[model samples]
Target: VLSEGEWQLVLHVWAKVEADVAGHGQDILIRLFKSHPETLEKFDRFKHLKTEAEMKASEDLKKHGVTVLTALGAILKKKGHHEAELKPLAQSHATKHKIPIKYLEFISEAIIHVLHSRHPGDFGADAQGAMNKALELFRKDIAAKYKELGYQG
Candidate 1:
């Protein structure tokens, strides 16, 4: 679980990304990646990324990490189908690193912190709204992913 500040940071990043993508289209991801090169490693197929190469290849944004995120945001917003989207991403990471769920949550929190700190003033009410939506969707996804893997709580 995240502390209050950490949770706020997560919301802030989510919101900022949502706002940027809504306002600027696919360019937002490229900008984000440019500003944070470390993110690329996290999504890299040989490293942190453990999903099927074909699937990951399809969404690969060169150096941009936003395409996968944007696709996830759309799924969370429209279909409310968190399981098929977010869970797979997390599971991919877990499988790749052979880490536990807590570590995945920590990565999530870390990503949120990095993104929020990088772009604090860019987000507004819409960002917060997106964060709220994302949190709800994440809860469902995390729950289902854990249950499917035989993890409790």
Candidate 2:
């Protein structure tokens, strides 16, 4: 549960991120891949790229990165009413994408890392805690849907 001030801090920081969604979004994915190379196996399009330089240059990565940020923006904006927005995305990952739900924590942490790097002044402890809670809310919503889809892994 986020306090009122914390919620406002999340929205404030997210505005900065949303301003350059592509750059930050791609960086988040890049950070995730760099930190956890095994996660690359899940992305067929990017799995073949061995180097970070190559991954950064890939258009597919940028496209998916922007898509990911867009989805997150929607979830953040909707706040408490995320069921409708999260269902399709959760289903896709649980079924077609076969993405383990655990990977979301990596993505969430990656987002926080990017936020801190990109906006150090604004992403202080309070903001970080707020963002963590926000992403946790988003993750829990998706997890519930994953369970409904019989994704135990």
C-alpha TM-scores of all predictions: 0.41, 0.94
Task: Give the Cα-based TM-score of candidate 1 against the true structure.
Answer: 0.41
Instruction: List, residue by residue over 1-153, the lDDT tens digit for candidate 2.
Output: 667787788889989988888888789999998888888898888888877789779999989899999888887877657789998998898898877767888888899999999899999999999899999998888888888999964
CA-only RMSD, every prediction: 8.8, 1.2
Per model, state how many residue pairs clash.
Answer: 1, 0
Clashes of 1: 1
What lDDT does each candidate get? 0.48, 0.86
lDDT of 1 by residue, 1-153 (tens): 334544454444656566655333224333434444444355445334333343335344432445546755555443343455666655654455344444434434444444445565644455544445455556556656666665543
Off by over 4 Å in 2: none
